[PDB]
Structure 1
Amino acid sequence: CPLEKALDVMVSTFHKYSGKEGDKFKLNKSELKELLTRELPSFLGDEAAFQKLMSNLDSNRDNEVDFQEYCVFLSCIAMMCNEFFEGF
């Protein structure tokens, strides 16, 4: 099931990076940087632009990205992709 495996990849990827330092279940600036760089290179197409992104994702303003904020982020990307299918 590509779809079930896709969910697996989404969930597992978060934890591959979140558990590196500090809170094991939350992405700090550094870990977020790794994940985006290694896992979503197409999206990231500089430190200031990173900060603007980190700010956007961290909606509860605790300086880190939890799984929930991570899902919202991925949905956002999905949202973009979907625009292609409706035919701009």
Structure 2
Amino acid sequence: SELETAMETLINVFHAHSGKEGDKYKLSKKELKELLQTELSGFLDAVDAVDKVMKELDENGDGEVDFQEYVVLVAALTVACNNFFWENS
């Protein structure tokens, strides 16, 4: 089903950039940045914003973003994108 394919895409995208350096299930900054710039063009602004973004997602604090912390991100970006396209104008 469409929903199931979508969650499959979220998993596959994560590992497509998570499996490039070191632990193939955790995103280091080079992999997080790679995911952000390639999958979310324009999400970064403002002096290095990439540091801020792992600082917020790295919940346990090991310097890498795993799947659950990455899902915390996808969720917030999904709800904001929804409010932007689905308002009782």
Q: TM-score range by the shorter chain?
A: 0.7 to 0.9
Gaps of 5+ in 2: none
SS in 2 for 1:24: coil
SS of residue paired to 1:26: coil
Q: In the alignment, which residue of structure 2 is the partner of 1:43? A: 43
**Which structure carries more strand by proportion?**
1
Query: More helix per residue: 1 or 2?
Result: 1
Letter in 2 for 1:81: C
5+ residue gaps, structure 1, are none
What is the 5 A alignment of 1:15-54? 15-44=15-44, 48-54=48-54
Mean Cα deviation higher: 45-54 or 23-32: 45-54
What is the total number of aligned residue pairs between the two structures?
Answer: 88
1:66 is aligned to: 66
Q: Measure how far apart 1:51 and its partner are.
A: 0.7
- Superposed CA deviations along residues 55-87 of structure 1, whole A, max 9, x for unmatched, are 111111110000000000100101211222245
Shift of 1:3: 2.1
In 1, the alpha carbon distance for the partners of 2:47 and 2:64 equals: 16
* Residues 46/21 of structure 1: CA separation in 2 closer, same or farther (3 Å cut): farther
- CA distance in 2 between counterparts of 1:52 and 1:2 reads 33
| TM-score normalised according to structure 1 size | 0.86
Q: What's the C-alpha RMSD, in Å, of the aligned pairs?
A: 1.9
Q: TM-score scaled to structure 2, two decimals?
A: 0.86
AA at the equivalent of 1:25 = Y
Which range moved further: 23-32 or 52-61?
Answer: 52-61
| Letter in structure 2 aligned against 1:69 | E
